[PDB]
Every structure is written in C-alpha cells, then in structure tokens.
Amino acid sequence: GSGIRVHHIKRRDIVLKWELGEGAFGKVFLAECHNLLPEQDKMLVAVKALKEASESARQDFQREAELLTMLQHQHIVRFFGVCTEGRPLLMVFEYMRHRDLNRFLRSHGPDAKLLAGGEDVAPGPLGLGQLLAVASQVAAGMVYLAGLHFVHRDLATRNCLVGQGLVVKIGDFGMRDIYSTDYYRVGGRTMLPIRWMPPESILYRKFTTESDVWSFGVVLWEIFTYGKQPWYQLSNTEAIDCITQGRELERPRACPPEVYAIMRGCWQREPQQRHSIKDVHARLQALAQAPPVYLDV
C-alpha cells in the first residue's frame, strides 16, 4: 500500500552497451537511457542488474529502491529509478566516469604500473587539496546519512564512486560486491569488512553512527595511502587482534599530521569519546580550503 514512489523506467529506453563490473547481487553495465529527463534526450547511465529474482530478492529490491529514492544528496550517487517489467530486475544511476574511488586512488598512486589518463586530472599523485576534497566529500555524505539515523555497515573507498571534475559520491550502501580480502567469512552469507570495523562491532556486534565515524577514519587512511588495504601484511585474525587491543594504523607517508590527528580521533575505543561526523567534516572542509605544507623526511 503506502510508500515512496520510485520512478519506473521502460526497458525500451535502456540499451546496455557493455559490462562495467560484477557482484554477488548481480552485474553492473554501462547503458544509454532515452527521454530519462527532458534536459538530455539520450544519455549514459550505470545499471545494476539482479542475478536471482525470487520474491525474497524482489522484497529486498523494493526496500532498496524505496530507501535509495529517499536518500538524495550532493554526495550520494544519483538514483534515477528501477525497471521491474521483465527479469532481470534493474536499478539505474548516473554514470560516474572515474569508477569506484578505490581503483581511482590506486591509479594515481606511486606503485601504479601504468600512468592514468583523463582530461579532468593530472596523471600520478594527486594534490593534498585534492585528497582533502575527496575526504571532505565522503564525510559530507556521511553527515547526511547520520542526519537520517542511517547506518552504513561497509563504508570503504570501494563503495564510493568518482565522477568528472573529481566529484566523490557514496555509491553502494552494501545491503553486494562478491568477496575480496577486505571481508572475513564468519558464516554462510555473513561476511564482515572487519578491517573497517571498530571494537564495539567485533566485540558486542553493535553498529551506530559512531561506528561509521570509526570506519570513515579507515577511509581517510585508504585515501592517504592511494587505496592500500588496512593491515595488508596481517590476516583477518591478526587485524581483529589489532583493532581489539587498541593497535592503530601508522600515519601514511603522504598524510599531514593535522589529518592523522583527525584519523586518531575517529579511532577512540569509547564511541562517545569519538568526534562527531559533523566535526570531522568541518576540519576537512577547512583544511581543503587552505591545504597546509608537507614534505617527506
């Protein structure tokens, strides 16, 4: 009965060009969409496609579509609508031409085996002001979602998308991507991105906006390491021991100590002793506006 209206889209207005990537829920394609919005008569979009189509997944899908349509903000990937008219089930978002933030970060890092193209940003390392631009944008999306008492349980650079002009949006809310080394399998269809998770979550399986503040800290770290795995030398086992024993990630080489300061604040053992997401953003927007000077050794 009652609910949020989700723009339905006619399958005929959706022409899949080619696969962009794959997940556990299903695949993502580049696609052309006709008469989606009056402004542009034909345009490029990302299209999520569901693998399996029972009434258990159609229930998920609907909630997901309802929730996606409610959460609309400057730093959250534009959702356009679904298409239910014949399997496969479809969700349509704006096309973000720099893909997920984790590969974008990796493509602009020193260890890059190729030099990254594009007309909107220089190959090789980014500017600090750029790094804080990225950091500030992700915080701004977290500030919104906290505002609505929404809890992201997999905040990580692999779930942010990067667009033309170095726009950074939150891209996926989990509710997806198959199985990397970031997730520890603790049971059938129960995997946790435990490296991003704070003590409260590992120890008491509690997750709050404060837990997200902790994991956003690990995202700053991802950003300032050009998308390295937290605790990459360690095992999921050894990581859990670190997190639970108060061992913290070392400041990155390319991280000013004023930024590391903000990280260290995200990583308080006591959730209530962690800075609010609003406060974290503030200090990031500020530093983005006036990047300090920093060198090496």
Ligand SMILES: C[C@H]1CNC(=O)c2cnn3ccc(nc23)N[C@H](C)c2cc(F)ccc2O1
């Ligand atoms: C398959 C990958 C790659 N997606 C795109 O290149 C890609 C480019 N634009 N865009 C829009 C949504 C979208 N992907 C893309 N949604 C998917 C589920 C998504 C979201 C993320 F935060 C991260 C990755 C991701 O999907």
